[PDB]
Design a protein around this ligand. Structure first.
Ligand SMILES: *[C@@H]1O[C@H](CO)[C@@H](O[C@@H]2O[C@H](CO)[C@@H](O[C@@H]3O[C@H](CO[C@H]4O[C@H](CO)[C@@H](O)[C@H](O)[C@@H]4O)[C@@H](O)[C@H](O[C@H]4O[C@H](CO)[C@@H](O)[C@H](O)[C@@H]4O)[C@@H]3O[C@@H]3OC[C@@H](O)[C@H](O)[C@H]3O)[C@H](O)[C@H]2NC(C)=O)[C@H](O[C@@H]2O[C@@H](C)[C@@H](O)[C@@H](O)[C@@H]2O)[C@H]1NC(C)=O
Ligand SMILES: *[C@@H]1O[C@H](CO)[C@@H](O[C@@H]2O[C@H](CO)[C@@H](O[C@@H]3O[C@H](CO[C@H]4O[C@H](CO)[C@@H](O)[C@H](O)[C@@H]4O)[C@@H](O)[C@H](O[C@H]4O[C@H](CO)[C@@H](O)[C@H](O)[C@@H]4O)[C@@H]3O[C@@H]3OC[C@@H](O)[C@H](O)[C@H]3O)[C@H](O)[C@H]2NC(C)=O)[C@H](O[C@@H]2O[C@@H](C)[C@@H](O)[C@@H](O)[C@@H]2O)[C@H]1NC(C)=O
Ligand code: CA
Ligand code: CA
Ligand code: MN
Ligand code: MN
Lengths: 239, 239
């Protein structure tokens, strides 16, 4: 069995186990700020930042046809300081081709280049979308399961607890092909759940990079924070 | 669309929207005690209690072949006062044939008569099992999805937070046929998730009774409490 796992209770600056891209940075306080925060403490618009684990993950093997089961957990907080314009754009946990660089920002969340369903993306993602684009359901924020497109195959609205820490659990059972995600706000006790069938063999390459990506809006002050406090991951390829 | 829903933030004695069976009873404090608590405040062994919603639910229609999506949420607490013998047996959320009376107690949780996979049970259940029977995995407690048998098709171990309130969310998406359940302990922040594919058309009759059942052990003092604080349910049959 081929296993891989990591667990960051907090982030330490200078760590070489994480690849920071775009605006992403680790603070001295141990927080991973996916998108830029200005000198005045306000989140900057037109910002995109990602963080990829430094080792690729063996998700499936073409030879034996076996696929890995995996689980990831992370805590984040989003703060929306302005009433107008509408805050944007959100953050997303994703898996895709190795050696990737950030894509388009804004509503594409740093992982897509357009709104088409393209098999060449080879990307699986679980988004926490805060801005309603024309390809989105009208309710925001919402959790969404993205398969080769920013147009989710399944969506679940949730109420943002402004600036409060949200705990997320995403689990994939290779046997049943079910991807199930849970979001809990300890502050209010709110629990949201979403699940959908996804056969990763039809989506992802055998080896993938796992990461988190965040983006702020295309217009002035259409922004919010995308802070991550911890992140753990584990995958097992039956072999 | 045929919809049905209920929501009990707390329970009131004398309420005629709930059918109490066996040892189940609602206290003046508004708590639903599934299993008996003695005069000295200790949980009694050899006890079985159930509570069914007073109206049957239309889960699927043979004529059109459509099936309902549903969701239930409830809060409970289990207290295990003795180190020996091992506490037993657990509680379970279930759906089965209308007009049912309690079955065998103990490890059968008041809903089964033996440990066979029998299609005549026509029962779907999500158990919170505290005692390891020969048909159980060795880890207890565990969440389990039961389909026509006490031998779960899927199990997930969890750590009991003795006497603390656990929040449960069980959701069934008819389109994908996924039954996903979540258990959260606000006290410790623990989150457990379990999902499996279940086609209710192959399991349940068109009309079902929904309920909660609990049972204590077969030997002296093999007991624990099975207290429920709230319970809501909603189902929608696309029509
Ligand atoms: C977080 O980042 C940490 C820092 O990078 C990770 O820890 C490193 O993990 C490296 C493995 O990828 C590991 O590398 C090996 O280092 C050996 C020498 O260092 C040890 O022994 C020294 C005395 O001999 C001692 O002084 C040190 O303190 C260490 O204890 C070295 O012998 C190994 O070489 C063998 O294997 C390599 C292939 O891996 C061959 O190329 C080589 O011929 C030889 O056969 C190996 O060296 C590394 O090899 C590749 C090369 O590019 C690297 O430059 C070279 O370092 C390294 O020891 C530790 N570093 C430290 C300080 O402990 C950490 O990884 C996790 O933890 C480690 C312990 C291991 O269990 C990993 O599998 C884990 O993933 C990162 N954590 C996470 C979650 O990602
Ligand atoms: C929790 O328990 C509650 C108490 O049982 C539930 O509320 C009852 O719900 C009954 C529906 O199942 C409802 O019954 C109807 O009552 C009508 C008369 O009462 C109202 O109007 C009076 C003045 O006219 C007023 O004084 C009262 O206070 C009420 O406002 C009556 O006209 C209805 O009869 C018609 O329909 C029936 C079929 O349902 C026909 O048989 C009849 O010919 C006529 O056409 C109906 O009467 C009931 O009929 C069936 C019979 O066996 C019953 O004995 C008879 O009562 C009843 O009014 C309320 N009770 C109260 C105090 O409000 C509650 O149900 C939920 O809430 C209600 C309001 C409704 O929305 C339900 O659909 C909900 O489920 C239970 N809650 C839950 C979550 O289960
Ligand atoms: Ca969007
Ligand atoms: Ca058992
Ligand atoms: Mn979206
Ligand atoms: Mn069991």
């Amino acid at each position: 069995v081929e296993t891989i796992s990591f667990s960051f209770s907090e982030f330490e600056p200078g760590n070489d186990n994480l690849t920071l891209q775009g605006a992403a940075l680790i603070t001295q306080s141990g927080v991973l700020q996916l998108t830029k925060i200005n000198q005045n403490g306000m989140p900057a618009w037109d910002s995109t930042g990602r963080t990829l684990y430094a080792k690729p993950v063996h998700i499936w093997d073409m030879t034996t046809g076996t696929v890995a089961s995996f689980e990831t957990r992370f805590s984040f907080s989003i703060e929306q300081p302005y009433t107008r314009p509408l805050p944007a754009d959100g953050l997303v946990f994703f898996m895709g081709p190795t050696k990737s660089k950030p894509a388009q920002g804004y509503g594409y969340l740093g992982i897509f280049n357009n709104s088409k369903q393209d098999n060449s993306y080879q990307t699986l993602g679980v988004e926490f979308d805060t801005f309603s684009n024309p390809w989105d359901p009208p309710q925001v924020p919402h959790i969404g399961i993205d398969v080769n497109s920013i147009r989710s195959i399944k969506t679940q609205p949730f109420q943002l607890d402004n600036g409060q820490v949200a705990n997320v659990v995403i689990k994939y059972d290779a046997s049943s092909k079910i991807l199930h995600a849970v979001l809990v706000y300890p502050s209010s006790g709110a629990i949201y759940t979403i699940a959908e069938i996804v056969d990763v063999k039809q989506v992802l390459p055998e080896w993938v990079d796992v990461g988190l990506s965040g983006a702020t809006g295309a217009q002035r002050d259409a922004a919010e924070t995308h802070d991550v406090y911890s992140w753990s991951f584990q995958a097992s390829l039956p072999e």
